[PDB]
Amino acid sequence: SKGEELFTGVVPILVELDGDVNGHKFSVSGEGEGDATYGKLTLKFICTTGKLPVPWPTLVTTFLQCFARYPDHMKQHDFFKSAMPEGYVQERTIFFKDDGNYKTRAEVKFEGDTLVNRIELKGIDFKEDGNILGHKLEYNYNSHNVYIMADKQKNGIKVNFKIRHNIEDGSVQLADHYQQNTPIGDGPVLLPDNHYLSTQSALSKDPNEKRDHMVLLEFVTAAGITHGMDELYKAMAKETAAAK
Amino acid sequence: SKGEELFTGVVPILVELDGDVNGHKFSVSGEGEGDATYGKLTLKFICTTGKLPVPWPTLVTTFLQCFARYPDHMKQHDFFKSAMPEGYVQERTIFFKDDGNYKTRAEVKFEGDTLVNRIELKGIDFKEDGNILGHKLEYNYNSHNVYIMADKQKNGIKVNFKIRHNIEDGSVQLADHYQQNTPIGDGPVLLPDNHYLSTQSALSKDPNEKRDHMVLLEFVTAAGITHGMDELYKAMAKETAAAK
Amino acid sequence: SKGEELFTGVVPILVELDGDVNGHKFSVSGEGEGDATYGKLTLKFICTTGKLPVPWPTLVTTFLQCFARYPDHMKQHDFFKSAMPEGYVQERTIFFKDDGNYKTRAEVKFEGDTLVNRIELKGIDFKEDGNILGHKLEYNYNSHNVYIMADKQKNGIKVNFKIRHNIEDGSVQLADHYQQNTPIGDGPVLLPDNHYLSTQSALSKDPNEKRDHMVLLEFVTAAGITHGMDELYKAMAKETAAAK
Amino acid sequence: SKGEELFTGVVPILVELDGDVNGHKFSVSGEGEGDATYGKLTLKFICTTGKLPVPWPTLVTTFLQCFARYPDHMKQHDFFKSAMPEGYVQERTIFFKDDGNYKTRAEVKFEGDTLVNRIELKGIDFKEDGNILGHKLEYNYNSHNVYIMADKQKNGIKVNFKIRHNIEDGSVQLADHYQQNTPIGDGPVLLPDNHYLSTQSALSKDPNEKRDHMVLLEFVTAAGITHGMDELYKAMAKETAAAK
Amino acid sequence: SKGEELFTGVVPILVELDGDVNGHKFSVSGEGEGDATYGKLTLKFICTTGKLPVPWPTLVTTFLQCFARYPDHMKQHDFFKSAMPEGYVQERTIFFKDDGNYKTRAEVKFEGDTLVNRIELKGIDFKEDGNILGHKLEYNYNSHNVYIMADKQKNGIKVNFKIRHNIEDGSVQLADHYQQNTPIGDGPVLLPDNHYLSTQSALSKDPNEKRDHMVLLEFVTAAGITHGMDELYKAMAKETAAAK
Incomplete structure (x- = not known):
């Protein structure tokens, strides 16, 4: 597709997240770069509201699958790049076994040369004595x-x-x-x-x-x-x- | 700095220009918005004196570098936002190769919630058979x-x-x-x-x-x-x- | 409209108010200037009868909406300037929750180069132990x-x-x-x-x-x-x- | 060494070449897999710029000696795997008898699970009536x-x-x-x-x-x-x- | 047949075995050479998982009958070489009298110049006080x-x-x-x-x-x-x- 051509080089990335987990409000801003030719991502995330109220590993999947490397024989299966530059909506429900869940909505698209991932996250039913809020x-x-x-x-x-x-x-x-x-x-x-x-x-x-x-x-x-x-x-x- | 905090959201922009190019007097008024978080600018300019006597592309650089996106690691290098809300004076001489020049003076600052760019432009030595006055x-x-x-x-x-x-x-x-x-x-x-x-x-x-x-x-x-x-x-x- | 053309520059303003709040008679005179191009107002008000019997913030809205900035795309919605220079009558009832009310009548119009706001105000049913008369x-x-x-x-x-x-x-x-x-x-x-x-x-x-x-x-x-x-x-x- | 342990299974390979031969610019992308346990390589190369301006056999040696099988008694002689995952620079000059030469520089290293070979090639002094440009x-x-x-x-x-x-x-x-x-x-x-x-x-x-x-x-x-x-x-x- | 011609000289051999005997997991890698002209085999086997849990002589038959010498008058009876280079599957059940059994599946074929024997072995019902697990x-x-x-x-x-x-x-x-x-x-x-x-x-x-x-x-x-x-x-x- 035409969209795949936007990923031939190093693309700057900007990630912005606003979250609420059990009423704890937080925001995260991330910057980095992607080189889909090698299916490679390098990002640094900062919690802009202070201390992150949840463990950083719980947010990894939420915080750009368009940077995946699709082998030549499989290029036609790359939905993610085909949707570009207009982008796509990515929605998830993440159910933590014996604990709460995250519900996320994101929009992944180009804003000029930058690939932007803007995310809304809501987490509920987390146990105060559990692995997530227990860190x-x-x-x-x-x-x-x-x-x-x-x-x-x-x-x-x-x-x-x-x-x-x-x-x-x-x-x-x-x-x-x-x-x-x-x-x-x-x-x-x-x-x-x-x-x-x-x-x-x-x-x-x-x-x-x-x-x-x-x-x-x-x-x-x-x-x-x-x-x-x-x-x-x-x-x-x-x-x-x-x-x- | 403190000034950078004024640019976290969408900021309304107002641009006003008064010019003289080879004695042709003109004025331009522009309105739009800026979102420095994404280094993004959307503006619409109107010539309020009739037909613009020069090509619109010659005025692009004259018609708000405070709306640039500075990566996190480089935030300390953003002079433009650090000068806000008091603002800054932006002066230029623009030398068109084998043709005339523009000399501009602008003041960029906040007037309430609006970011205002007020500009004085003088153009001289333009050739009547040249690319600029020739459109x-x-x-x-x-x-x-x-x-x-x-x-x-x-x-x-x-x-x-x-x-x-x-x-x-x-x-x-x-x-x-x-x-x-x-x-x-x-x-x-x-x-x-x-x-x-x-x-x-x-x-x-x-x-x-x-x-x-x-x-x-x-x-x-x-x-x-x-x-x-x-x-x-x-x-x-x-x-x-x-x-x- | 034709009226909007009267607001392209800095316009001198004169405000005159005569009031009665719970029988306390007072007068206020204000002078300043407006620059509707930037939706901007700068005014200084003097109580000409001595001490103002009410808090100054209760009089702000009473003491020239023709100085508002209407974006280009919305100029046709500016009633205030379209009524000029003949002007308009502005009438209000202001109900202070759990307290009294002000009833005002004003005439806003040009008198030569000056934009004049002349106001009659009557305030009743204010509580002596309340926030207004209590300052x-x-x-x-x-x-x-x-x-x-x-x-x-x-x-x-x-x-x-x-x-x-x-x-x-x-x-x-x-x-x-x-x-x-x-x-x-x-x-x-x-x-x-x-x-x-x-x-x-x-x-x-x-x-x-x-x-x-x-x-x-x-x-x-x-x-x-x-x-x-x-x-x-x-x-x-x-x-x-x-x-x- | 530690590097040899990265080659015990099937490893995906990605090859990228940018070349200039007598001013003819071309690029080649290759994908495949290697199984060093059996000293085996399976690769498919595509000329991404159109027709390859030189014969494919002239590029074979340029287009991953880390996939060689070293007998047990000789494992200590395997420089190629010992340099992994950091990798190595491979430089060549290839002199075609009675014709031109290729000068190449490559970097062979892991990028995640993939073994990558990135190559720069310059060819000069080739004869238009010769075996190479004559195909x-x-x-x-x-x-x-x-x-x-x-x-x-x-x-x-x-x-x-x-x-x-x-x-x-x-x-x-x-x-x-x-x-x-x-x-x-x-x-x-x-x-x-x-x-x-x-x-x-x-x-x-x-x-x-x-x-x-x-x-x-x-x-x-x-x-x-x-x-x-x-x-x-x-x-x-x-x-x-x-x-x- | 055509396959017999692949055995006229010294052929390198590679043997790889993965086994489980009464739940004891082990692997063996062997290297050597064969000269079918003289019906001769020279091999060295290493247990790559540590100590072999069974006696080495129990694995001899499991660890390349294509290296047998068939007299001239009997060349037509050599199935083993006729199947080459594609190779053959060799399956066995080995019943140790008054003890357990081994079940093996192997693929014997050429991989380039090398004759490869890859084997899967499962041993069950061995007695802990018996000759095999008793060494x-x-x-x-x-x-x-x-x-x-x-x-x-x-x-x-x-x-x-x-x-x-x-x-x-x-x-x-x-x-x-x-x-x-x-x-x-x-x-x-x-x-x-x-x-x-x-x-x-x-x-x-x-x-x-x-x-x-x-x-x-x-x-x-x-x-x-x-x-x-x-x-x-x-x-x-x-x-x-x-x-x-």
């Missing part, structure tokens, strides 16, 4: 699979995945993500066949930063559709010998 | 780099840049801009280190408007100072593996 | 919205708004304003569609002045009617990329 | 020996080899390769003793692909250092009988 | 006969044999091997008549090796089909005299 999550991040299917009825996609959050004691806190993406523009988009994104993330701190913050490095590659060239490679491997 | 400039606008340095002696900044004006035949008309900004108030300002602003502009017409006018959409982002976190991101990229 | 109002002023609708039957406008008066203890004293304006002249006027005025005011004292007085600085901008150019700006923002 | 090379590939020595002075390796390119008429076009590899990271690397890599390659086309492209299947095994167990095997062969 | 097997190996018959129904062969494992006390532990081989490719293979392979093996240790390992030297020759030239040799032996 019992390790400051690290697992590798996940993000499952994508077309949602023809809504001219978009339905996305589902379970994130694993390591807890201090060695247990694992699960968060079930129900997601849907819909284009903002009225133009045609690419609707994909079933596939997935393979994610990997590193969390760190900027030693110079005094504000409550998170440094995120993330790599995302699409997978799940075959390139159906196994029989070609097999023929060549034979040919290696057919003459030898 | 040979295409109604479009290029992307430029605006170089900024501190001017400690004047408690302000010195700004320099060359704009490229596309001509009907495919040639390019250059305009060398020499600019200086000085605070109006007696309070301390932020004096920056060398950096630049990256600009992008779109010119259009309001199909309903009968008066001679210009619709301008502009995005400006500051750049040039590093965030010096390349070695941190490198350490995390290693760590991605150090345990894997 | 419990803070010497400051809030920002309000003044709602305007056409009153075709009377060839004028109906105006309604609630002012918030900060009280010493931190409570807020409300004053419900019911207003109507009718032209003095027999000529056609501009009757508007529903809109509002956004007001902001600063109260201060002249350190040299020995008389009971008030210094007022006020900015008023009309709003509420869209410029319906959001879809144009959206097209340009796309075009920014359509070629890039 | 007289057969679309096939010979088996070669790649000679490796330590370069202690540069903390890397020096590599030298001659490739044989079959020409339409039955002649053979030689290309002398002068190569050097240097680590990107500041950590210790394995510096080898003299050895070689034995290469075998098959070129094919994807019958479904409309773009100018090349499918490559390649096997590389290190050799040249003895396992010095010939005398042990000799003793066992004797023992086979010593009791019989 | 009571002598580190030596007997000479056996491997009986081969065509399996037309499966386009392959059925193989059966009993191995003799010397025990510390002088007893002999038997292992009944039930084997089947089926081609991986869809091309025709040589299906043999009934015959056998005569095997001889020597086990040793590499005195320099610190890892748990096994050095294997093995010779295998096919037999069982007569060359039917006994009557010719008899005629010549007569002729020796018929003239003398």
Whole structure:
């Protein structure tokens, strides 16, 4: 598509979030850059209202899947870039097992050269003695699979995945993500066949930063559709010998 | 600074210009809004004296750099907002290659909630057979780099840049801009280190408007100072593996 | 309209008020200037009968909406200037919650180069132990919205708004304003569609002045009617990329 | 070393090349996978600028020696994997006998899970009537020996080899390769003793692909250092009988 | 056949095994070379997971019958080489008398110049006080006969044999091997008549090796089909005299 051409180089990113979790109001601003050619993301997030009332790892998925690397054979399955520059609405409900939930609405689009992610988040039913409000999550991040299917009825996609959050004691806190993406523009988009994104993330701190913050490095590659060239490679491997 | 806090939301803008180019007297009034959080400007200019005697693209730079987006790591380099609300004087000489020049003086400041840009312009030595008085400039606008340095002696900044004006035949008309900004108030300002602003502009017409006018959409982002976190991101990229 | 042309520059203002509040007779004379191009008002009021028997903030709204700034796209909604120079009658009833009321009649018109506001005020049913006659109002002023609708039957406008008066203890004293304006002249006027005025005011004292007085600085901008150019700006923002 | 552990499974590969040969600008993007356990490489290259201005076989050596299979007894001689994940710089000059030369600079490293090869190529002094710009090379590939020595002075390796390119008429076009590899990271690397890599390659086309492209299947095994167990095997062969 | 031509010289071998015996997980990697012209095999196996949980002699048969020497008169009976380079699947159940069993699945094929044997092994019902988990097997190996018959129904062969494992006390532990081989490719293979392979093996240790390992030297020759030239040799032996 035309949208994919906007991602050939390094694109500046701006993330803005306004949240309420059990009545605790907070805001986060993030800046960084993305290089979709390598499915790469480098971002630094600052809590602009003081101390973040929830663990930073609970916000990773909320805080730009258009920066995923789609292999050549699978380029037609990239809904995210096809919706650009007009962008898309990304909606989620995140159910933390035996705890509360986050409900988010975001708009991801270009504002000049910048790719902007503006998010509204509401969290409810969190337990004061639980892992989230108890800040019992390790400051690290697992590798996940993000499952994508077309949602023809809504001219978009339905996305589902379970994130694993390591807890201090060695247990694992699960968060079930129900997601849907819909284009903002009225133009045609690419609707994909079933596939997935393979994610990997590193969390760190900027030693110079005094504000409550998170440094995120993330790599995302699409997978799940075959390139159906196994029989070609097999023929060549034979040919290696057919003459030898 | 305190001034930067005046730019967190959408700010109404009012622009007023009085000009004389080779004795042709004209006035322009502009209205719009700015959202510095996204380095974004939306303005509509009307020539209130009839037909504009010069091409609209020659007036773009004259017709609010306080609406630029300064990345978090570079906020201390934003002279423009630090001078607010008292404002600043912006002076330029614009030398059109092989043609005349414009000399401008403007005062940019708040008047209540409105950010006001009041400008005096004098143009001389323009050739009647030239690109400017000949109206040979295409109604479009290029992307430029605006170089900024501190001017400690004047408690302000010195700004320099060359704009490229596309001509009907495919040639390019250059305009060398020499600019200086000085605070109006007696309070301390932020004096920056060398950096630049990256600009992008779109010119259009309001199909309903009968008066001679210009619709301008502009995005400006500051750049040039590093965030010096390349070695941190490198350490995390290693760590991605150090345990894997 | 023709009337709007009388407001292009700085216009001198003269305000004269004669009042009776619970039988306390007083008079106020004000002088200043208005610059409607910037929706700006600068006035100094003197109580010419001695000590003012009521708090100065209760008289702010009574003591020239023709000095409001109407955006270009909304100029046809400016009743106030369309009635000039003949002027208009401005009538109000101001109901102070759990206290008395003011009933005012004013004539706003040009007398030579001067814009004159002559007012008759009667206040009744004020409580001697209340906030008004008790002088419990803070010497400051809030920002309000003044709602305007056409009153075709009377060839004028109906105006309604609630002012918030900060009280010493931190409570807020409300004053419900019911207003109507009718032209003095027999000529056609501009009757508007529903809109509002956004007001902001600063109260201060002249350190040299020995008389009971008030210094007022006020900015008023009309709003509420869209410029319906959001879809144009959206097209340009796309075009920014359509070629890039 | 630690780096060798990154190659135990199937690793995705991404290759990006930007070239200029006698002023003809071109770019190539390649994707595939490597399984160093079997010294195996499967890659598909696309010319993203249109028609490739040179024969595909001239680019094979330029377009990931870390995927070579080092026998157990020789694992300490694998510089390529020891430099990972930080990676290495690979520089070459390729002198085509009686024709021009290519000068290349590449960076081979991990970007998340992907092994990336980014290359800059400049070709000069090619003859318009010659085998290269004449496209007289057969679309096939010979088996070669790649000679490796330590370069202690540069903390890397020096590599030298001659490739044989079959020409339409039955002649053979030689290309002398002068190569050097240097680590990107500041950590210790394995510096080898003299050895070689034995290469075998098959070129094919994807019958479904409309773009100018090349499918490559390649096997590389290190050799040249003895396992010095010939005398042990000799003793066992004797023992086979010593009791019989 | 064509496949036999791949075995005229020394062929490098790579063996990879993943096993589970009574829940003990282990892996073995082997490297060596084969010279089928002389029915000769030289291999060194390393346990890559630590200590091997079973005796090395129990794994000999699991850890490349394509390296057998078939006499000239019997070349048509060599299924193993006829299946090359595509290779074959080799499946076994090995029943250790009065003890557990191993079930194995292997794929034997060329990967470039290397002959690869990749094996999955599962062992169950082994007695903790028995010879296998008790490590009571002598580190030596007997000479056996491997009986081969065509399996037309499966386009392959059925193989059966009993191995003799010397025990510390002088007893002999038997292992009944039930084997089947089926081609991986869809091309025709040589299906043999009934015959056998005569095997001889020597086990040793590499005195320099610190890892748990096994050095294997093995010779295998096919037999069982007569060359039917006994009557010719008899005629010549007569002729020796018929003239003398």
